[PDB]
Design a protein around this ligand. Structure first.
Ligand SMILES: Nc1ncnc2c1ncn2[C@@H]1O[C@H](CSCC[C@H](N)C(=O)O)[C@@H](O)[C@H]1O
Ligand SMILES: [Zn+2]
Lengths: 51, 257, 253, 52
């Protein structure tokens, strides 16, 4: 989700939270489990598919 | 009727300056050369009136493409629109279109300025935790380093940019990237051992992605996979030594310093 | 506790990154080292829990006490943010010292990039450093150590106003030290080579200093702590025939 | 007052623009003293620091 990424990149608190507990943060921000999977695997090409 | 070129830095959303974002926000029209789709979406959500200059690319000579870009930008300025150009990183570093548009704007008598932004070099210092002031710093374009005479000071941190297209020319294309990189290795070998550790660096675009910081011996450079953005960091191979002459002039000694 | 070092840029308020400003705002405590009072007043309004480091000015000892103080906050468990002007990792060893020490004590520590004076220089002077190439040295380091500049490419000497500063042995003026710097540079640059004293604006109503003069007049120049000296090329480019040859380019082009 | 103006001017592009159009007017509209306006006009950073 662009919105999540936009926020993550501009909000220091979210950044700090994400770094320690990424899956939870991403879930709380309404990311799908496959989106989270893609991120945690660094599969950017997949994230694009879901953009 | 004005032109302001701003940079967005390397990271999405976060690395743009406060003022630069304000410029985009209050602009009548915005021309963009951004990397990815997330950047574009961020920009549009900030100001919906955007022209993606990447439409002038081969969907042709880059000069021609660039001309169309500058012309498109100036068209808005000439129309009396408060025009803002949103570029990646620093709008003045490796940015022909930006400089051309500003020059050509000032020439037609329009107000035009460039707002500094965070560059890849800026991200490099931070990511690697290296101070260019530590032992100094030299930056060259890789092809220029190969084509022309540039003797590096091996006490400094040396940066060769656009390493991907190192030594690339119509007459050198019978060679492979690996071949040209091998030639660069031999060149550098004058000052740096074949086992000297060097770093391939690429700043991150997305906040869920990390910068590329690949450490390898110089000798393996030719086998490396390189991206257009790739940069080569070559740390010092010799440690600083005192200028006992200059020291003597000031009557001081290493200890005094 | 954690440590994040950020930069505020050169211009007041506007030249800090969105993310960096967020770090200051969410910080439990902030250690500052900014240019003027305007900058300081701006910071305070971002986070009322500010500790001004400017209250510690030997440089070594000064910095050692700055770092120690920052670390005290981190040790106490505070989410600590150090705010420096320009870029916190460019000619600024207080940040690197604090980060190095924090890591050693097993704390999270990182640095966010900011806009440096050099970034401002390129924009203000309409130079593209990417195509041109560029070099940077600390003026004093350039004097005290064996550095060899490439006179074909732009050369920046930082902290030119303190060039040749040292433990006092014999009486020497700033002019004297600069004169020695000129003679040293004269190896590569004619005495009449035009150089540029640059100072980026710190206030929005202020224009930058872009003063040009012959190298020979440097010692008589009025310099400020913020002054950076630009020395444009003095040597013409020459073909790397040897490397060109290997690439497949002969003198017959 | 001077500080608040400088701060906003440095981060607000719209204000920056408005200022360029009519500096004095904008400064006056922001409750700056004539001497302050002068200091700005004469680029008397010193006098501005003093006024501050
Ligand atoms: N306004 C300004 N214009 C030009 N150079 C400046 C400047 N302020 C600081 N400098 C340079 O920086 C040196 C101080 S060290 C601090 C540098 C800062 N981290 C940065 O990113 O720029 C000065 O001696 C000078 O060389
Ligand atoms: Zn540099």
């Amino acid at each position: 989700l662009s919105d999540f990424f936009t926020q993550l990149g501009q909000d220091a608190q979210l950044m700090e939270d994400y770094k320690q507990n990424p899956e939870a943060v991403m879930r709380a921000h309404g990311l799908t489990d496959e989106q989270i999977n893609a991120v945690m695997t660094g599969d950017m090409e997949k994230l694009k598919t879901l953009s | 009727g004005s032109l302001v070129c701003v940079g967005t830095g390397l990271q999405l959303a976060g690395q743009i300056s406060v003022l630069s974002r304000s410029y985009i926000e209050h602009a009548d029209i915005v021309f963009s050369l951004l990397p990815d789709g997330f950047s574009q979406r961020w920009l549009t959500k900030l100001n919906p009136n955007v022209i993606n200059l990447q439409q002038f690319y081969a969907q042709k000579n880059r000069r021609d493409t660039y001309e169309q870009m500058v012309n498109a930008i100036l068209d808005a300025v000439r129309a009396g629109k408060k025009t803002v150009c949103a570029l990646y990183g620093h709008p003045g570093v490796f940015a022909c279109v930006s400089h051309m548009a500003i020059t050509r704007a000032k020439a037609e008598g329009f107000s035009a300025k460039m707002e500094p932004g965070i560059s890849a070099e800026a991200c490099l210092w931070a990511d690697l935790g290296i101070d260019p002031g530590n032992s100094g710093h030299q930056s060259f374009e890789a092809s220029q380093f190969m084509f022309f005479n540039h003797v590096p000071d091996p006490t400094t941190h040396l940066l060769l940019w656009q390493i991907a297209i190192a030594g690339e020319h119509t007459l050198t294309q019978f060679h492979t990237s690996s071949d040209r990189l091998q030639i660069l290795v031999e060149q550098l070998n004058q000052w740096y051992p074949l086992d000297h550790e060097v770093v391939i660096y690429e700043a991150a675009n997305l906040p869920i992605q990390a910068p590329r910081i690949e450490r390898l011996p110089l000798a393996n450079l030719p086998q490396a996979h390189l991206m257009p953005i790739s940069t080569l960091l070559i740390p010092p191979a010799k440690k600083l030594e005192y200028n006992y002459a200059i020291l003597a002039k000031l009557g001081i000694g290493p200890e005094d310093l």
